[PDB]
Symmetry: C3
Subunit: 337 residues, 3 copies
């Protein structure tokens, strides 16, 4: 339908046409909206609308102490009333539709979301956390004041969360494929591991099929085989820290004897619902009263923000040392609607 929220006193309502604004890499969907204000209520006050992209990292108690990392990556402030020159660019048919039903006390606003900006990512809070979640969020905020500097008023202000999202590219990428050979010393023996995925791109909730082939031309015994999907979150503040969290694991007592080959497909699905306990897991941005998913793969630089990526790991568990592994990068994304 149309998305709208009011101030607590109801003197102020913001309408938007949607909450998700798609990053097309060359450009982003612009935010076209309308603020409706009560006339006699603001009086000499002005109506401002603000678009903020904010990046916060740190627990709630670090907020009070001024220790958490809080940076606005993007701020645009718009004086919507008293009305201003019309560009940019026209009014969209949604604004026109809304300015008619609401009348002269409705006022359009327009923002472009800069492309060089992270997408909406929520870092999953633990059950104890009570503040707002760490990550990158976007917020449309409308309020009434004499000037931008005047402090905030809760009763007058509407805060509205929106999201910058990306969708799977249309061009299929190259097939993920990796291999690792453990050579053994003087003898010509070796323990060979090959693995691959059918494709580079998977959709949330779609099972990955991991092709595993083991050539054990050695005297060691593979005693377990472990297949996992790991999330990689690059947190870029002053220094970029990379956090890894497994989000799916199949572990079987499959054995590969000496002088033997082994070939199987392992099917595995990364789901947020098996990971609601992992603090700090990257989630696609938290919306109102909706459910989210594991954060989509970022389509790219180490500017401030959060970059998310995924890999399959296949590990051959050998006794003592001797373990063998490959990793398979893939992409995890929603399909374009």
């Amino acid at each position: 339908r149309v998305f709208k929220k009011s101030s607590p006193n109801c003197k102020l309502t913001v309408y938007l046409g949607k909450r998700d604004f798609v990053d097309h890499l060359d450009k982003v969907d612009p935010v076209d909206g309308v603020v409706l204000v009560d006339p006699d209520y603001l009086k000499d006050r002005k109506v401002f609308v603000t678009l903020t992209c904010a990046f916060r990292y740190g627990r709630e108690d670090l907020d009070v102490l001024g220790l958490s990392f809080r940076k606005d990556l993007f701020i645009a402030n718009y004086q919507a009333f008293p009305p201003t020159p019309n560009p940019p660019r026209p009014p969209t048919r949604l604004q026109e539709r809304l300015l008619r039903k609401l009348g002269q006390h409705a006022h359009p606003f327009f923002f472009t979301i800069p492309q060089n900006l992270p997408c909406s990512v929520t870092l999953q809070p633990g059950p104890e956390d009570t503040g707002k979640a760490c990550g990158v969020d976007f917020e449309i905020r409308a309020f009434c004041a004499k000037s931008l500097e005047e402090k905030s008023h809760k009763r007058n202000s509407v805060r509205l969360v929106i999201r910058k999202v990306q969708f799977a590219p249309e061009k299929p990428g190259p097939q993920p494929s990796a291999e690792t050979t453990r050579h053994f010393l003087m003898s010509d023996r070796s323990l060979h591991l090959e693995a691959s995925l059918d494709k580079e791109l998977y959709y949330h909730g779609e099972p990955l099929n991991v092709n595993v082939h083991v050539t054990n031309n050695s005297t060691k015994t593979v005693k377990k085989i472990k297949v996992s999907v790991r999330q990689y979150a690059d947190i870029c503040l002053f220094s970029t820290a990379q956090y890894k969290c497994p989000v799916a694991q199949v572990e079987q007592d499959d054995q590969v004897s000496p002088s033997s080959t082994f070939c199987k497909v392992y099917t595995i699905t990364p789901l947020l619902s098996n990971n609601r306990e992992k603090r700090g897991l990257a989630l696609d941005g938290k919306l109102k009263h909706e459910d989210t998913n594991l954060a989509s793969s970022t389509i790219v630089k180490e500017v401030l923000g959060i970059l998310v990526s995924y890999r399959v790991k296949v590990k051959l568990v050998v006794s003592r040392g001797g373990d063998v592994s490959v990793e398979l990068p893939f992409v995890l994304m929603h399909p374009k609607p």
Copy 2:
């Protein structure tokens, strides 16, 4: 009876007449006590008594790193032995009673608690926290040394926690009453919410009766009604952060159809016992092996400290947008004994 505690080696005991010292706004009950020392034990050492009002904010691991906020808001140091001039002001009948039963090795001490000081508030720790709790505490400390600068000794020192408390004013304040009207666009329609409490002041454990009246002269349908009590903790460090935590909620699928009125009382009771899981909730100061309650409303400025306050929220849940709300400030306090 009389409150007393000894050092671990028992060479030193502090007696006080009570643990709660009442803030009367114009003044505070003074701390009149006695320290009993073993004569031959201190020898050339002096006996000091200290009254400290301390304000700490931050988890335990931040202590070690020097990151937590720790400020003594008030320190008074008293050399009780070798004895000193008698004022102020006399000895109280409690000190006289105690100096008789204990004799020449008992020594009085006297402190005034400055009024411009927060009251005792404990921030509720999570099950994981193991240090002392954040908040504002008062401590009488007695110990033996050559001078005040000499470092602390656990075996010699007695630490005794006391509380600065407030009680409900005698004059009833004005009846809490609020209203919010959602006007609808061009049509003369409206969705009106009125609410009130019988009184401004409630006692811990006393039920609040929330009078709710809804006039739905609109086409929208109230589908749920939500009544809650929220604690508001103003944490004033360098910047004042306000934390909110609900501590009671009634949520019913009560509906208010278009062109209809609705009138009901909702009864709701904020109890700590339904909130033992909420980390950082403001509690009246933690005493020894006793149970506490939700922190009392502060009777007032943004000096360093913790200010606590309470509100009822009444929310009419309407589909899509359209929600309507009022808030009702009230005071929550113990009655004066």
Copy 3:
């Protein structure tokens, strides 16, 4: 057997003769090992081996913000290939054994662990923590690069955790024995507590026998008796903080009437398995996929590090005030193999 681990790509393996290196107080077992490299893989790159003793304190989110305390207490960097002069000192019979089976692409390395260094201690993480644990750890790291400054590569590098450990001295120390007398005012009454352990040194998992004797020549009634073992962790960063955590408790409603004596042995055993919930408890260093124990007593200065020590507390619970206590230091250590 022999301990070995490879890089993820298997081009690089580090062998060591053991993982625990014993601090003999006058000196430490040296780390004698071998790195095996694939010849054509490194090409123009060099092989380095690093011995690092690291000290980290702080939760995971403080890492990203640069707030945690991270200090390398000791770093030694060794260019093992292209080979270098032979001392020190010879090659051990383990290196010789290994250089034969592996051949010319195996290269010895040798490190002395400085004595003035803490032992391996892990601070017990909570279930929520996901990073590496706080405490003091030692790590052998081998990798391929042109120079030491070149950044790290995960596929090339092997990381291997080792431990600096201590064992119980051979000379028995003096018997722990303490006493505390509560004298009562004017009357010649008194409440006397004596306690002792059979010995100063106990082994992990060995029960302590606490000899308790109470002479109640007073009018007060001991109503409970509490015996506990407490861990004391001195965390020495910029300022040394001492953290205490009980790790065993016997609490009985044993009573000692006025004009009565009382004599009993209380047996108590500190076990990690009854304390897996205590965040920050000092543990002997966490090895790979093994189980650990409560940290051993440190055999000593307040340099940077973690010092661990233990005491029995015996407390006589008297009504109102009047409690009486002693503490008994003891040592808790593994026997030398």
